[PDB]
Amino acid sequence: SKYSQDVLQLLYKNKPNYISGQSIAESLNISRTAVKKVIDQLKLEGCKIDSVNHKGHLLQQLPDIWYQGIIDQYTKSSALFDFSEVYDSIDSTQLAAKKSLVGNQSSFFILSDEQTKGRGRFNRHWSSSKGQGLWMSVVLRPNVAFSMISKFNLFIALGIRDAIQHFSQDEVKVKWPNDIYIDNGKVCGFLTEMVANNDGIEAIICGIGINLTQQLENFDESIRHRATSIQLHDKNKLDRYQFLERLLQEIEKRYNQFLTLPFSEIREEYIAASNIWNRTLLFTENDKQFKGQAIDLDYDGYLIVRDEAGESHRLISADIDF
């Protein structure tokens, strides 16, 4: 109803205390019996609320559904983000962000439970199952030259990687410059884009897709053998809100490093996180394909590649298969 998000927001805000129907009813100026109806419905959606005669209601567990009311709390206490928008289903959080950034300087993010038109690099389809992942776009406003897009993109990778690590029992590695893996399974893809002119960046838009609870059964057969989710490498139920919150904290940590440190300061760290070394790599460059080895990441974040014919290249980006 009209008041669901508001009841939720008050339940979240008052943890680990109970609040009474009465009291929620006075906050929103609505009837006690309307509070009960709203709470009955939150429980049907799979909210876990402890309801005790005489004492009140306590939010114990949120379901796998993003709630604007709750995300409104993540943004209130945030030093980085002016607001967020949350959607059950959208074409793409990246289209939505590129539309929402026009004409303002806000920083914000957009989450959606499903995407019907998720795209990755080179307009590739990005599978965005309802209820099974974090499909997010983040809009930031670094005051910097357009050439710093590539640098942004290196820092945020370690951000994302640390957030996924904290929940997997298995090893989490970056595949430069845009993919994160747990063993041979792709668990996340992200893409950093910018609006800019000669004078500087007007906005960075970082689309980030993280598989959270798909079983292998839930992926499509064309991608199933090289996909995995955080849940398949966690003994405990993975809690999206707990994940989201960890992720926001890392994005913010790496964004500040991004603004303050040269790439040389995180380069060894990135090196030790990467899974592209001592193994043969397939590169696609339009028409051409060619095999190659990753030799080094240089101080400015270019990949140094020795291809199958002994020739050396220095690359700002690539698409690599294994």
Added chain:
Amino acid sequence: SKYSQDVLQLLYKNKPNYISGQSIAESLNISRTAVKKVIDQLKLEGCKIDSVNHKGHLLQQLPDIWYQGIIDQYTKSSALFDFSEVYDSIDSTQLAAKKSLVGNQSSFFILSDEQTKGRGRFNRHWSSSKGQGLWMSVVLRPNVAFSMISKFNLFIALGIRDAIQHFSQDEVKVKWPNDIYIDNGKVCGFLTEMVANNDGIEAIICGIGINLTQQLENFDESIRHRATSIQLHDKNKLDRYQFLERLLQEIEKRYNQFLTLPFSEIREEYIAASNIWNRTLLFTENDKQFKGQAIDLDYDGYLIVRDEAGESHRLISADIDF
């Protein structure tokens, strides 16, 4: 009315022939007496239509108002542009373009007779008087690396300059990298922006503002002494449609050169068009200001500057005052 643009489109299309009310009335499936009403109104708006008993109507002159119906003809015959949008008044053709490019690969342009929120570089106010100029944003789709924004921007300048030259009796010069002058008057500003990621440009958006018929009286007093319009340097009435058409042809010529030639091929041409040489220049770089001389434009389009203290800089962009 509902059918104005359609009547107009048919009048434009049939030049230099007359078409009869009867015949327009059969094209649109409407009554002869509705055709007369539509034509009476186009004349009130200041269309110049020759109406001859027995023979019909011929469009002689369009007023200083953009008409979707007519611009629909410029796009139909165009090899570059999928469509256009035309507005009597908008916040900014640049905001509109940045919103319209999301989620598609169309190339298009947006014109508006006035802007209420025109912006130039560094969020400066761009005066966009109703009826007195060309306020346009152009969206193109070069398949190229994000670093080619600066190059795009050099080629389009000569495009714009040639289009303004063709109508002024006086000399038209470029002020690198974003301004065109006729004597000491600023007659146009333009700005090239991009949406891009590491893999390439998703879109170029080029905002172009050209003063067409302001009298010096029509500008604001803060800018009046360094502003001019094409009309103040033309003996003949300047015809916006004739201008627009010339401008589209040059944008297209320079866009193809842009796709095909290295900067070195137009560099001398640009040099001879520029007004920044043999004179003292003020540079703004955030906090700092400093005087300097333009020494050369290099083959990659950087300005070589000897500042007042004998130090040399190599600049991709700048804001220069005289």
